[PDB]
Design an enzyme around this catalytic site. Structure first.
Site, PDB file in Angstrom:
ATOM      1  N   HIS A   1      16.178-102.921  37.510  1.00 43.46           N
ATOM      2  CA  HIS A   1      15.560-103.854  36.322  1.00 43.46           C
ATOM      3  C   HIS A   1      14.557-104.578  36.815  1.00 43.46           C
ATOM      4  CE1 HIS A   1      17.158-108.067  33.881  1.00 43.46           C
ATOM      5  NE2 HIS A   1      15.805-108.270  34.629  1.00 43.46           N
ATOM      6  N   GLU A   2      14.967-104.947  38.153  1.00 50.15           N
ATOM      7  CA  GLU A   2      13.387-105.406  38.756  1.00 50.15           C
ATOM      8  C   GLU A   2      12.219-104.512  38.533  1.00 50.15           C
ATOM      9  OE1 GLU A   2      15.374-109.315  38.764  1.00 50.15           O
ATOM     10  OE2 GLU A   2      13.825-108.725  39.112  1.00 50.15           O
TER      11      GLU A   2
ATOM     12  N   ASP B   1       0.928-100.469  45.626  1.00 47.69           N
ATOM     13  CA  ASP B   1       0.569-100.868  44.081  1.00 47.69           C
ATOM     14  C   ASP B   1       2.465-102.008  44.201  1.00 47.69           C
ATOM     15  OD1 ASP B   1       0.172 -98.239  41.839  1.00 47.69           O
ATOM     16  OD2 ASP B   1      -1.178 -99.063  42.628  1.00 47.69           O
TER      17      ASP B   1
ATOM     18  N   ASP C   1      22.181-106.483  55.410  1.00 47.87           N
ATOM     19  CA  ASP C   1      23.604-105.332  54.820  1.00 47.87           C
ATOM     20  C   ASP C   1      23.537-104.081  54.794  1.00 47.87           C
ATOM     21  OD1 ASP C   1      22.723-108.328  53.974  1.00 47.87           O
ATOM     22  OD2 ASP C   1      23.091-108.224  52.506  1.00 47.87           O
TER      23      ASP C   1
ATOM     24  N   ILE D   1      19.716-116.823  41.140  1.00 45.46           N
ATOM     25  CA  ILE D   1      18.783-115.931  40.391  1.00 45.46           C
ATOM     26  C   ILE D   1      19.469-115.270  41.983  1.00 45.46           C
ATOM     27  CG2 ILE D   1      16.687-115.169  41.635  1.00 45.46           C
ATOM     28  CD1 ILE D   1      16.607-116.732  38.494  1.00 45.46           C
TER      29      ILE D   1
ATOM     30  N   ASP E   1      16.969-119.633  45.878  1.00 40.74           N
ATOM     31  CA  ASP E   1      17.981-120.299  45.795  1.00 40.74           C
ATOM     32  C   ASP E   1      19.042-120.603  45.950  1.00 40.74           C
ATOM     33  OD1 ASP E   1      19.233-119.717  42.574  1.00 40.74           O
ATOM     34  OD2 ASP E   1      19.298-118.126  43.617  1.00 40.74           O
TER      35      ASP E   1
ATOM     36  N   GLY F   1      -2.761-107.395  44.187  1.00 40.19           N
ATOM     37  CA  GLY F   1      -2.209-108.468  45.045  1.00 40.19           C
ATOM     38  C   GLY F   1      -0.429-108.175  44.755  1.00 40.19           C
TER      39      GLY F   1
ATOM     40  N   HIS G   1      13.095-109.416  29.385  1.00 38.51           N
ATOM     41  CA  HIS G   1      14.227-109.151  28.749  1.00 38.51           C
ATOM     42  C   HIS G   1      14.405-108.761  27.671  1.00 38.51           C
ATOM     43  CE1 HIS G   1      14.919-112.268  32.188  1.00 38.51           C
ATOM     44  NE2 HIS G   1      14.738-110.674  33.001  1.00 38.51           N
TER      45      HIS G   1
ATOM     46  N   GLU H   1      21.475-112.933  48.722  1.00 36.56           N
ATOM     47  CA  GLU H   1      22.844-112.274  48.711  1.00 36.56           C
ATOM     48  C   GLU H   1      23.501-110.757  49.530  1.00 36.56           C
ATOM     49  OE1 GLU H   1      23.255-114.311  46.239  1.00 36.56           O
ATOM     50  OE2 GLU H   1      21.285-114.089  45.795  1.00 36.56           O
TER      51      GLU H   1
ATOM     52  N   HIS I   1      10.888-104.742  35.200  1.00 40.20           N
ATOM     53  CA  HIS I   1       9.379-105.705  35.228  1.00 40.20           C
ATOM     54  C   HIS I   1       8.577-105.609  36.016  1.00 40.20           C
ATOM     55  CE1 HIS I   1      11.984-109.306  32.801  1.00 40.20           C
ATOM     56  NE2 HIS I   1      12.766-109.219  34.246  1.00 40.20           N
TER      57      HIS I   1
ATOM     58  N   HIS J   1       9.537-118.058  49.879  1.00 46.46           N
ATOM     59  CA  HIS J   1       8.669-116.740  50.284  1.00 46.46           C
ATOM     60  C   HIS J   1       7.127-117.279  50.305  1.00 46.46           C
ATOM     61  CE1 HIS J   1      10.995-115.883  47.154  1.00 46.46           C
ATOM     62  NE2 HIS J   1      10.035-114.372  47.167  1.00 46.46           N
TER      63      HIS J   1
HETATM   64  N1  LIG Z   1      19.842-118.591  36.286  1.00 49.45           N
HETATM   65  C1  LIG Z   1      19.471-117.560  36.183  1.00 49.45           C
HETATM   66  O1  LIG Z   1      18.756-116.864  35.292  1.00 49.45           O
HETATM   67  C2  LIG Z   1      19.718-116.706  37.114  1.00 49.45           C
HETATM   68  C3  LIG Z   1      20.683-114.968  36.579  1.00 49.45           C
HETATM   69  C4  LIG Z   1      20.803-113.839  37.637  1.00 49.45           C
HETATM   70  N2  LIG Z   1      20.090-112.979  37.268  1.00 49.45           N
HETATM   71  C5  LIG Z   1      19.129-112.609  38.377  1.00 49.45           C
HETATM   72  O2  LIG Z   1      18.429-112.664  39.152  1.00 49.45           O
HETATM   73  C6  LIG Z   1      18.145-111.308  37.604  1.00 49.45           C
HETATM   74  C7  LIG Z   1      18.428-109.939  38.296  1.00 49.45           C
HETATM   75  C8  LIG Z   1      19.112-108.806  37.563  1.00 49.45           C
HETATM   76  C9  LIG Z   1      19.420-109.020  36.198  1.00 49.45           C
HETATM   77  C10 LIG Z   1      19.869-107.926  35.510  1.00 49.45           C
HETATM   78  C11 LIG Z   1      20.731-106.943  35.818  1.00 49.45           C
HETATM   79  C12 LIG Z   1      21.929-105.958  35.265  1.00 49.45           C
HETATM   80  C13 LIG Z   1      22.058-104.774  33.957  1.00 49.45           C
HETATM   81  C14 LIG Z   1      22.845-103.900  34.290  1.00 49.45           C
HETATM   82  C15 LIG Z   1      23.550-103.310  32.792  1.00 49.45           C
HETATM   83  C16 LIG Z   1      23.197-102.099  33.386  1.00 49.45           C
HETATM   84  C17 LIG Z   1      24.202-101.557  32.342  1.00 49.45           C
HETATM   85  C18 LIG Z   1      24.398-102.251  30.978  1.00 49.45           C
HETATM   86  C19 LIG Z   1      24.346-103.100  31.292  1.00 49.45           C
HETATM   87  C20 LIG Z   1      23.910-103.595  31.616  1.00 49.45           C
HETATM   88  C21 LIG Z   1      23.485-104.068  34.979  1.00 49.45           C
HETATM   89  S1  LIG Z   1      22.267-104.800  36.415  1.00 49.45           S
HETATM   90  C22 LIG Z   1      20.918-106.490  37.352  1.00 49.45           C
HETATM   91  C23 LIG Z   1      20.036-108.716  38.278  1.00 49.45           C
HETATM   92  C24 LIG Z   1      22.527-113.277  37.919  1.00 49.45           C
HETATM   93  O3  LIG Z   1      22.739-112.733  36.970  1.00 49.45           O
HETATM   94  N3  LIG Z   1      23.316-114.155  38.441  1.00 49.45           N
HETATM   95  C25 LIG Z   1      24.199-113.617  38.024  1.00 49.45           C
HETATM   96  C26 LIG Z   1      25.404-114.466  39.603  1.00 49.45           C
HETATM   97  C27 LIG Z   1      26.287-114.175  40.032  1.00 49.45           C
HETATM   98  C28 LIG Z   1      27.254-114.638  41.358  1.00 49.45           C
HETATM   99  O4  LIG Z   1      27.213-116.040  40.689  1.00 49.45           O
HETATM  100  O5  LIG Z   1      28.250-114.488  41.999  1.00 49.45           O
HETATM  101  C29 LIG Z   1      25.394-114.066  37.085  1.00 49.45           C
HETATM  102  N4  LIG Z   1      26.122-112.806  36.984  1.00 49.45           N
HETATM  103  O6  LIG Z   1      25.032-114.977  36.269  1.00 49.45           O
HETATM  104 CA   LIG Z   2      20.343-116.420  44.755  1.00 48.47          CA
HETATM  105 CA   LIG Z   3      21.967-110.802  52.371  1.00 45.48          CA
HETATM  106 CA   LIG Z   4       1.652-105.056  44.798  1.00 47.96          CA
HETATM  107 ZN   LIG Z   5       9.167-113.849  45.715  1.00 49.47          ZN
HETATM  108 ZN   LIG Z   6      15.275-109.978  34.855  1.00 49.72          ZN
END
Ligand SMILES: NC(=O)CC[C@H](NC(=O)CCc1ccc(-c2cc(-c3ccccc3)cs2)cc1)C(=O)N[C@@H](CCC(=O)O)C(N)=O
Ligand SMILES: [Ca+2]
Ligand SMILES: [Ca+2]
Ligand SMILES: [Ca+2]
Ligand SMILES: [Zn+2]
Ligand SMILES: [Zn+2]
Length: 159
Positions: free
Chosen positions: A114-115, A54, A20, A76, A71, A86, A124, A97, A118, A64
């Protein structure tokens, strides 16, 4: 506290690249996400091009090989494993996406920040202004700053 890297010098490698974006846009976004947490901790991040790292960055879809299938478009967007050997520490992005450098599709830099939190041992946050809040929102990339909760968070782990 959960697991933490037992060194402050930490390496990562990008396993593969999403179609992308331009490849140089992926390296930038990812380097920058690492920069974010590097700026508020005693942690140093070194990208390796080949060999043992690491943190592995992966773009993959559906099931995967880790027990945590993605999904399809939406839902997600990415997940990561806490510190450890590992697959520990690794960060995976859902190829279903559409990854961007901007506010359309899913911004990669934001998701990486965010990732990688973790990958460093963070949970969270219950604060909506924290990057570690469970849901994705686009915020202006130019002006993006970690929240005070995020900083408390990473600093309780390292320093
Ligand atoms: N089942 C679950 O638990 C899915 C949750 C899913 N999350 C995930 O998969 C997690 C990955 C992740 C989590 C959090 C963030 C962000 C936080 C911020 C931020 C920055 C500054 C201030 C405040 C905030 C910027 S971006 C980005 C990536 C998700 O967000 N999904 C989207 C769906 C989007 C779509 O359909 O287009 C949503 N918004 O709910
Ligand atoms: Ca997805
Ligand atoms: Ca893609
Ligand atoms: Ca590793
Ligand atoms: Zn994975
Ligand atoms: Zn998270």
């Amino acid at each position: 506290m959960g697991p933490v890297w037992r060194k402050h010098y930490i390496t990562y490698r990008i396993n593969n690249y999403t179609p992308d974006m331009n490849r140089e846009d992926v390296d930038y976004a990812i380097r920058k996400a690492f920069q974010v947490w590097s700026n508020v901790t005693p942690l140093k991040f070194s990208k390796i091009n080949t060999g043992m790292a690491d943190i592995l960055v992966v773009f993959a879809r559906g099931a995967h090989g880790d027990d945590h299938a993605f999904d399809g478009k939406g839902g997600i967007l990415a997940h990561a494993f806490g510190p450890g050997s590992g697959i520990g520490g690794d960060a995976h992005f859902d190829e279903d996406e559409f990854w961007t450098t901007h506010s359309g599709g899913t911004n990669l830099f934001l998701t990486a920040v965010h990732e990688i939190g973790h990958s460093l041992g963070l949970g969270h946050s219950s604060d909506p202004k924290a990057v570690m809040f469970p849901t994705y929102k686009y915020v202006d990339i130019n002006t993006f700053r970690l929240s005070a909760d995020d900083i408390r968070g990473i600093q309780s782990l390292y320093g």
